[PDB]
Design an enzyme around this catalytic site. Structure first.
Site, mmCIF file in Angstrom:
data_model
loop_
_atom_site.group_PDB
_atom_site.id
_atom_site.type_symbol
_atom_site.label_atom_id
_atom_site.label_comp_id
_atom_site.label_asym_id
_atom_site.label_seq_id
_atom_site.Cartn_x
_atom_site.Cartn_y
_atom_site.Cartn_z
ATOM 1 N N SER A 600 -1.167 43.122 49.083
ATOM 2 C CA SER A 600 -0.655 42.915 50.431
ATOM 3 C C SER A 600 -1.387 41.749 51.082
ATOM 4 C CB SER A 600 -0.815 44.186 51.259
ATOM 5 O OG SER A 600 -0.004 45.226 50.745
ATOM 6 N N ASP A 811 5.007 50.626 53.235
ATOM 7 C CA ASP A 811 4.586 49.731 52.166
ATOM 8 C C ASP A 811 3.452 50.440 51.424
ATOM 9 O OD1 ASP A 811 4.569 47.502 50.518
ATOM 10 O OD2 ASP A 811 3.147 46.407 51.794
HETATM 11 C C1 FAD Z 1 3.322 46.085 46.784
HETATM 12 C C2 FAD Z 1 1.966 46.401 46.153
HETATM 13 C C3 FAD Z 1 0.935 46.045 47.024
HETATM 14 C C4 FAD Z 1 -0.396 46.247 46.639
HETATM 15 N N1 FAD Z 1 -1.508 45.869 47.560
HETATM 16 C C5 FAD Z 1 -2.885 46.089 47.150
HETATM 17 C C6 FAD Z 1 -4.020 45.712 48.074
HETATM 18 O O1 FAD Z 1 -3.779 45.234 49.130
HETATM 19 N N2 FAD Z 1 -5.400 45.938 47.652
HETATM 20 C C7 FAD Z 1 -5.682 46.536 46.312
HETATM 21 O O2 FAD Z 1 -6.791 46.728 45.942
HETATM 22 N N3 FAD Z 1 -4.553 46.897 45.430
HETATM 23 C C8 FAD Z 1 -3.174 46.669 45.853
HETATM 24 N N4 FAD Z 1 -2.095 47.036 44.962
HETATM 25 C C9 FAD Z 1 -2.401 47.615 43.649
HETATM 26 C C10 FAD Z 1 -2.740 46.448 42.699
HETATM 27 O O3 FAD Z 1 -1.560 45.821 42.319
HETATM 28 C C11 FAD Z 1 -3.475 46.949 41.447
HETATM 29 O O4 FAD Z 1 -2.789 48.040 40.909
HETATM 30 C C12 FAD Z 1 -4.923 47.347 41.772
HETATM 31 O O5 FAD Z 1 -5.536 46.373 42.554
HETATM 32 C C13 FAD Z 1 -5.700 47.460 40.459
HETATM 33 O O6 FAD Z 1 -5.317 46.379 39.635
HETATM 34 P P1 FAD Z 1 -6.148 46.109 38.226
HETATM 35 O O7 FAD Z 1 -5.413 45.089 37.389
HETATM 36 O O8 FAD Z 1 -7.535 45.611 38.542
HETATM 37 O O9 FAD Z 1 -6.240 47.524 37.386
HETATM 38 P P2 FAD Z 1 -5.259 47.814 36.089
HETATM 39 O O10 FAD Z 1 -5.664 46.926 34.936
HETATM 40 O O11 FAD Z 1 -3.824 47.533 36.478
HETATM 41 O O12 FAD Z 1 -5.414 49.407 35.668
HETATM 42 C C14 FAD Z 1 -5.622 50.336 36.708
HETATM 43 C C15 FAD Z 1 -5.433 51.764 36.125
HETATM 44 O O13 FAD Z 1 -6.591 52.308 35.877
HETATM 45 C C16 FAD Z 1 -6.397 53.900 36.099
HETATM 46 N N5 FAD Z 1 -7.501 54.444 36.857
HETATM 47 C C17 FAD Z 1 -7.918 54.038 38.060
HETATM 48 N N6 FAD Z 1 -8.962 54.801 38.410
HETATM 49 C C18 FAD Z 1 -9.186 55.678 37.421
HETATM 50 C C19 FAD Z 1 -10.122 56.680 37.266
HETATM 51 N N7 FAD Z 1 -11.236 57.261 37.991
HETATM 52 N N8 FAD Z 1 -10.127 57.424 36.169
HETATM 53 C C20 FAD Z 1 -9.212 57.202 35.194
HETATM 54 N N9 FAD Z 1 -8.292 56.220 35.342
HETATM 55 C C21 FAD Z 1 -8.285 55.462 36.460
HETATM 56 C C22 FAD Z 1 -5.272 54.081 36.741
HETATM 57 O O14 FAD Z 1 -4.257 54.681 35.822
HETATM 58 C C23 FAD Z 1 -4.788 52.685 37.170
HETATM 59 O O15 FAD Z 1 -3.436 52.621 37.078
HETATM 60 C C24 FAD Z 1 -0.682 46.812 45.381
HETATM 61 C C25 FAD Z 1 0.353 47.168 44.516
HETATM 62 C C26 FAD Z 1 1.675 46.961 44.906
HETATM 63 C C27 FAD Z 1 2.855 47.325 44.010
#
Ligand code: FAD
Ligand code: HEM
Ligand code: FMN
Length: 814
Positions: A600, A811
């Site tokens: 966001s 959102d």
């Molecule tokens: C419209 C939209 C808006 C968004 N806005 C924001 C924002 O403003 N700020 C923000 O931080 N994110 C936001 N997100 C989420 C963001 O896109 C990511 O999903 C998030 O930031 C983590 O991304 P990553 O690639 O670092 O983790 P990833 O590589 O994508 O993997 C994360 C996965 O790790 C798993 N996981 C997490 N915690 C644990 C746990 N304790 N134990 C076991 N498994 C776990 C979960 O299954 C999670 O899905 C938004 C998503 C959408 C769709």
């Protein structure tokens, strides 16, 4: 009614019923549209929308239309010109007709735009709001009935690439309509003009209509097949799925056919176990109020009153549905639950395809894990034919090799607008500081410089980011796999007529593909475990990989426990199963693509025009497999110190009210404060321009005041300047009982109600917090029920109406 949106919907009731009951539109709904009649409507629409958008541009700054100016989202003249080039050839400019009814419509449009612009809304409403409703289904009906390319040529008029959610955008547009200040007599004239526009469309449709005047069991025995895929379809999606399934059948050791269940007495399901290793699949779409597709009606009726003994029959069902309906996948669920009632046994779990989301992705996932379950059920462990061929380029220049870019070759170095999903802009990391004050988690505030990208955005829009896997992971995988990562190669699909010629941009090295193109962190799907089972030396680990492909039985328990629940990435699997020594090209064929991650936007383009601010929480956790896992995008961004980030911007419908006087009630626990910051910025900015700004209420939530109070100092400064009217912060972990934002909203119920009812405020709900949106929703239900004396049902109706008028926006994410 009183709000203009409701008055327009009610006033245009009969004329809408009539327009969609016109003979032309009825023929359209039944799929009986001809290319000549379609060319006719499309040319007429070209003329009409040219006139409409001409007058819109003429009055785009008139206060009686200004709030409705959405050129980038709604306008059609460009797409209509594309479709004219498609349907009438290169010289369509003089080849398209101009029927008298079309000229009548255009003349009325010009009269309105020239001398009565206060009515222009009534026409935009009649067209644009209509294109965002029935048009989505009409486009599919056209694709199937006329047989157009799947690439979308000829139907660009029905495509809105800047509107990712037509429902939410219609809410926003209704909101912008209700902002129009007008006297009651003018409101009545506007509704009458909307009726007139509907009548113009009706008589256009009428004028254009005036211008038109062998049992499959024994069949499979003589054809030598063991798989049949019946499709229950209306607009061709289930047919497409069934055909692709039966096409995969032949390239897997088996042999299948896609057939229509209509002209087959399915009593030939009891005759089917007499074919060696036979199984039947059903791709069933559901319509109406949980009703079957017409081509399966007989089938459905047959399953009603029947008792055919289907013992020893093998089946699988994938359903096509939409979560917005409240009979979700009734047909697929019914066929699934019922075939087991008749005696058959399920081979793979029933698939539940959502059309609200990405139905294609759901089906691809289902198929991808379905085929291994079949290959591991019947024991036909032949191990299947590949789909991509390896071609190593041992001597090749570097200026011809993909180095991680997404679109064209050397598009990361030769950056040219426009920038979007297929051509991301590399924004310069200007800032990257810590917002979290404690050490529970690391929460960061990044700033991306997009000075000369010509990228536009608004507060509430989203920014997507293409990340890169941790290079230590890549090196470890290349080590344990015993291969060279810097080998320039390519993977070429020998499914010759599939224009998806590669799994990712090629030619490139394995290091580059692992770093930028593939997802090496999420738990692996069943298909990759099946295709890796043939590379396990020990039969214990090979048998484990095999059993993990069984959707039923303790194989699913093993897969869910040791992989999903334990959160094992590909490297962890290769480590704990040292028998696995697969090649690297097959691995690069099996792994899913690395997805972009959305955030966001935490800044206003009115105060930060050349910068996009991101507010994120870093993902990092100790998985039950012992290893410590890191989030791809958040770790990648955390390492960025002022350093480029490939990003693009996706339009949302989260928008501040057009009138600066309108008050806003923002609710955002945790990272959900991200867009509101932007809001507040812009709100503050409007105060500095001398405009009158209404109340700006923030309901933020965190754990402790000294731990993760995001933007404490900036929020304090905003509050003391008057920009932020109220700072209501709920600290969940500062005593014995937890205090959430729901309780703060409940506290200010009286003032909130006076803002909503008398002030006409907009409510915003944002953030990750699970089960929070519904709690805030119930809180507002109770507030409205109490202060505006109402039954609970009246209150939920009131709040739902607010959501329709674009005054309760959401959102949420995960
Ligand atoms: C419209 C939209 C808006 C968004 N806005 C924001 C924002 O403003 N700020 C923000 O931080 N994110 C936001 N997100 C989420 C963001 O896109 C990511 O999903 C998030 O930031 C983590 O991304 P990553 O690639 O670092 O983790 P990833 O590589 O994508 O993997 C994360 C996965 O790790 C798993 N996981 C997490 N915690 C644990 C746990 N304790 N134990 C076991 N498994 C776990 C979960 O299954 C999670 O899905 C938004 C998503 C959408 C769709
Ligand atoms: C093919 C025949 C049609 C079908 C199946 C159809 C279907 C629908 C549906 C389902 C909605 C509700 C969407 C919602 O409430 O958010 C709707 C609303 C609407 N339709 Fe139609 N429609 C058809 C023809 C037309 C035509 C020809 C027009 C005008 C040219 C039109 C204009 C509208 C408008 C303006 C709305 C919005 C009403 C509102 O919410 O205020 N429709 N239509
Ligand atoms: C008039 C209509 C009614 C629908 N009703 C339902 C429904 O009740 N339940 C559901 O899950 N999906 C419903 N859908 C969603 C369809 O199942 C979905 O669009 C599916 O992809 C259609 O597949 P097809 O193109 O093969 O016909 C409906 C769609 C339309 C157009």
């Amino acid at each position: 009614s009183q709000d203009l949106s409701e008055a327009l919907k009610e006033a245009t009731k009969e004329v809408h019923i009539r327009a969609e009951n016109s003979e032309f539109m009825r023929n359209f709904q039944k799929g009986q549209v001809s290319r000549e009649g379609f060319k006719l409507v499309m040319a007429s629409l070209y003329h009409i929308y040219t006139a409409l958008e001409e007058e819109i541009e003429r009055n785009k700054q008139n206060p009686v239309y200004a709030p409705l100016y959405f050129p980038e989202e709604l306008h059609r003249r460009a797409a209509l010109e594309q479709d004219m080039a498609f349907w009438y050839g290169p010289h369509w400019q003089e080849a398209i007709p101009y029927t008298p009814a079309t000229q009548h419509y255009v003349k009325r449009l010009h009269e309105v735009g020239g001398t009565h612009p206060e009515l222009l809304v009534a026409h935009a409403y009649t067209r644009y709001l209509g294109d965002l409703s029935g048009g989505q289904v009409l486009k599919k009906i056209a694709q199937k009935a006329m047989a157009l390319p799947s690439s979308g040529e000829g139907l660009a008029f029905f495509t809105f690439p800047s509107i990712d959610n037509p429902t939410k955008f219609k809410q926003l547009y209704r909101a912008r309509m209700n902002t129009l200040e007008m006297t009651p007599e003018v409101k009545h004239r506007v509704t009458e003009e909307a009726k007139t526009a509907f009548l113009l469309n009706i008589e256009l449709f009428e004028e254009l209509q005036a211008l038109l005047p062998s049992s499959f069991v024994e069949k499979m025995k003589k054809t030598g097949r063991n798989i049949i895929v019946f499709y229950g379809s209306q607009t061709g999606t289930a047919e497409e799925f069934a055909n692709r399934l039966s096409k995969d059948a032949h390239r897997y050791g088996m042999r299948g056919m896609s057939a229509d269940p209509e002209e087959y007495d399915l009593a030939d399901l009891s005759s089917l176990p007499e074919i060696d290793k036979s199984l039947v699949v059903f791709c069933m779409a559901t319509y109406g109020e949980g009703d079957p597709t017409d081509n399966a009606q007989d089938f459905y009726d047959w399953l009603q009153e029947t008792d055919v003994d289907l013992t020893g029959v093998k089946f699988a069902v994938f359903g096509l549905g939409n979560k917005t309906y409240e009979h979700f996948n009734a047909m697929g669920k019914y066929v699934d639950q019922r075939l087991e009632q008749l005696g058959a046994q399920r081979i793979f779990e029933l698939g539940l395809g959502d059309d609200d989301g990405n139905l294609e992705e759901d089906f691809i996932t289902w198929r991808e894990q379905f085929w291994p379950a079949v290959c591991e059920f019947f024991g036909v462990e032949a191990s299947s034919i590949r789909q991509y061929e390896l071609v190593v380029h041992e001597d090749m220049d570097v200026a011809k090799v993909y180095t991680g870019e997404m679109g064209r070759l050397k598009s990361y170095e030769n950056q040219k607008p426009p920038f979007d999903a297929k051509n991301p802009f590399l924004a310069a990391v200007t800032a990257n500081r810590k917002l979290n004050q404690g050490t529970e988690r690391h929460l960061m505030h990044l700033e991306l410089d997009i000075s000369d990208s010509k990228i536009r955005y608004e507060s509430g829009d989203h920014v997507a980011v293409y990340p890169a896997n941790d290079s230590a992971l890549v090196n470890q995988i290349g080590e344990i796999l015993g291969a060279d990562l810097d080998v320039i190669m390519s993977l070429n699909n020998l499914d010759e007529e599939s224009n998806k010629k590669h799994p990712f941009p090629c030619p490139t090295t394995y290091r580059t593909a692992l770093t930028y193109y593939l997802d090496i962190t999420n738990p692996p799907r069943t298909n990759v475990l099946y295709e890796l089972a043939q590379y396990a030396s020990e039969p214990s680990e090979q048998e484990h990989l095999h059993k993990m492909a069984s959707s039923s039985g303790e194989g699913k328990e093993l897969y869910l426990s040791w992989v999903v629940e334990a959160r094992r990435h590909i490297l962890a699997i290769l480590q704990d199963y040292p028998s696995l020594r697969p090649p690297i090209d097959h691995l690069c064929e099996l792994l899913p693509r690395l997805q972009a991650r959305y955030y966001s936007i935490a800044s206003s383009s009115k105060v930060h025009p050349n910068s996009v601010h991101i507010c994120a929480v870093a993902v990092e956790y100790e998985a039950k497999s012992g290893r410590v896992n890191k989030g791809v995008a958040t770790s990648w961004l955390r390492a960025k110190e002022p350093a480029l980030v490939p990003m693009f911007v996706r339009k949302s419908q989260f928008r501040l009210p057009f009138k600066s006087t309108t008050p806003v009630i923002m609710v955002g626990p945790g990272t959900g404060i991200a867009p509101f910051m932007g809001f507040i910025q812009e709100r503050a900015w409007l105060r500095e321009q001398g405009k009158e700004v209404g109340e700006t209420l923030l309901y933020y939530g965190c754990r402790r005041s000294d731990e993760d109070y995001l933007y404490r100092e900036e929020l304090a400064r905003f509050h003391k300047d008057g920009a932020l009217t109220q700072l209501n912060v709920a600290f969940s972990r500062e005593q014995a009982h937890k205090v959430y934002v729901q309780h703060l909203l409940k506290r200010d119920r009286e003032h909130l109600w006076k803002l909503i009812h008398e002030g006409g405020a907009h409510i915003y709900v944002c953030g990750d917090a699970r089960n929070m949106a519904k709690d805030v929703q119930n809180t507002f239900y109770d507030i409205v029920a109490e202060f505006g004396p109402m039954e609970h049902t009246q209150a939920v109706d009131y709040v739902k109406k607010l959501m329709t008028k674009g005054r309760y926006s959401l959102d949420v994410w995960s």
